[PDB]
Design a protein around this ligand. Structure first.
Ligand SMILES: *C(=[N])C1([N]C(=O)[C]([C]C2=[C][C]=[C]C(Cl)=[C]2)[N]C(=O)[C]SB2345B678B9%10%11B6%12%13B6%14%15B%1272B632B436B94(B%10835)[C+]%11%13%14[C+]4%1562)[C][C]1
Length: 254
């Protein structure tokens, strides 16, 4: 195929509402789980021609995947996709919308930025327990609300391979290194200038573009819609900026 200079998953597959949804992981180190259920929600819709149009549950993955790390303390990407393939994941929206089988138990909050929600602060919740029961008002049993994938894989550390993967199969999960200057991000194309490493983060790459010739990836963060560019940010593309091209994980439903 021929890679266009820009691409936006939200515009190619506008029926799939999840693609344009920005979630909030709250006072929980569950970024690994959010980039996963987000992109799986997207891919379930894309690769099924719109048939599954759902919001997969972040708390189901977070709480039940023992091989994925330590829940709100952090986790690993590849295993989250293996869990989706082997056990599947039920539906579940944010806490506020309280929809689907298992909605998120934690409230929106501001992640080192100004806005309408309360500050998150530094305190971290304990990982919720693996319930395996839907909320009472949801009319399907847990076991049967499960959405499974068929494969899971890493994507080659190559810009063009990542681009081809996104355009054909949909948004991907990716890890990158967080430096202190990322916490002051409001807008623009980000790149590490100042600050020391605070860890890694896991997000959803949904596209790319170019602004006055500067190439970037377009990425959905999980710190709610008040953060960055309406919940999204942009980061230098093509230089493995903060290892943005090195920890790409995805999977297919068929
Ligand atoms: C979010 N929210 C956070 N982050 C996270 O989780 C991360 C993701 C990633 C991964 C990989 C790479 C990258 Cl760049 C990113 N993670 C982390 O940090 C990890 S934590 B842990 B692991 B091993 B496993 B379990 B898990 B835990 B520790 B050890 B390590 C084991 C234990 C949070 C912030």
């Amino acid at each position: 195929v021929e890679i266009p200079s820009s691409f936006d998953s939200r515009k190619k597959w506008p029926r799939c509402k999840s693609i344009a949804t920005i979630r909030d992981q709250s006072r929980c180190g569950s970024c690994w789980a959010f980039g996963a259920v987000e992109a799986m929600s997207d891919r379930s819709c894309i690769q099924s021609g719109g048939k599954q149009n759902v919001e997969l549950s972040a708390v189901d993955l977070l709480s039940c995947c023992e091989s994925c790390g330590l829940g709100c303390e952090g986790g690993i990407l590849g295993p989250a996709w293996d869990y989706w393939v082997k056990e599947g994941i039920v539906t579940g929206s944010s806490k506020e919308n309280h929809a689907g089988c298992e909605p998120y138990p934690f409230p929106k909050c501001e992640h080192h930025t100004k806005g309408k929600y309360p500050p998150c602060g530094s305190k971290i919740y304990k990982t919720p327990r693996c319930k395996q029961t839907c909320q009472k008002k949801y009319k399907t049993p847990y076991t049967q609300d499960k959405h499974r994938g068929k494969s899971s894989y890493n994507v080659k550390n190559d810009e063009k391979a990542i681009q081809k993967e996104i355009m054909k199969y949909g948004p991907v999960e990716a890890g990158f290194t967080v430096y202190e200057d990322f916490l002051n991000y409001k807008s623009g194309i980000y790149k590490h200038i100042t600050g020391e490493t605070l860890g890694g983060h896991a997000i959803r790459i949904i596209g790319w573009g170019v602004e006055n010739k500067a190439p970037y990836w377009l990425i959905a963060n999980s710190w709610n819609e008040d953060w960055g560019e309406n919940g999204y940010f942009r980061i230098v593309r093509g230089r493995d900026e903060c290892s943005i091209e090195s920890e790409v994980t995805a999977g297919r439903i068929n």
